[PDB]
Amino acid sequence: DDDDQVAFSFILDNIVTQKMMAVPDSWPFHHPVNKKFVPDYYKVIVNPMDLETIRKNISKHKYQSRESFLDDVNLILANSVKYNGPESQYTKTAQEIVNVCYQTLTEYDEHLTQLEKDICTAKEAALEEAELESLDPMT
Ligand SMILES: CN(C)C(=O)c1cccc(-c2cn(C)c(=O)c3[nH]ccc23)c1
Ligand SMILES: [Ca+2]
């Protein structure tokens, strides 16, 4: 909710919508799998992920780092490797989603490096204030 977290999330959301979702034939990854359409999916995938869920997470500011966002991006790929196989066209398409994620992030490397540091400085200051305000039981 701070300016820096809002700017960080703004970059992640644009990478998802403008770049990752534009990969050709990426539609299997745009939304959660519906068991009515893929009956055995959740018998095999125990940690499902998709781009819409990532966008809901970005909206809630779940990610304060590239690494945490990229953990969920990578889950999409890993799940396709498990469910479809490493050589499936599903998995080739997932791989391209991940590649264009990494490539687009690199175009923002300096600014995202700074934003991650500034988010973490502000979180730490706010944590230390909240700890001190509780510890004195006066107010
Ligand atoms: C809401 N929609 C569009 C679906 O539930 C839907 C429909 C048709 C296919 C898929 C599908 C998705 N993903 C991620 C796969 O790895 C996969 N492997 C075989 C089919 C699929 C999902
Ligand atoms: Ca107090």
Q: Which atom of ligand 1 is nearest to the CA of 35?
A: 5
Measured distance CA(97)–CA(29) in Å, rounded: 9
Distance of CA 122 to the CA centre of its chain: 21
Neighbours of ion ligand 2 (CB under 5 A): 133, 136, 139
Residue range(s) defining the domain that contains residue 100: 1-139
66 C-beta neighbours (distance < 10 Å), count: 21
CB distance 15 to 130 below 8 Å:
no
Pocket test for ligand 1, best of 26, 27, 41 (most atoms within 8 A of CB): 41
CATH, residue 33: 1.20.920.10
User: What contacts 39, CB < 8 A, 6 or more positions away?
Assistant: none
Give the residue carrying structure tokens 């990854």. 29
Measured distance CA(114)–CA(45) in Å, rounded: 35
Instruction: Please report the resolution in angstroms.
Output: 1.2
**What are 64-69's contacts with CB under 8 Å, separation 24+?**
64/5, 64/8, 64/116, 64/119, 64/120, 64/123, 65/116, 66/105, 66/112, 66/116, 69/12
CB distance 101 to 119 below 8 Å:
no
Tally the domains of the chain: 1
Nearest CA to ligand 1 atom 21: 28
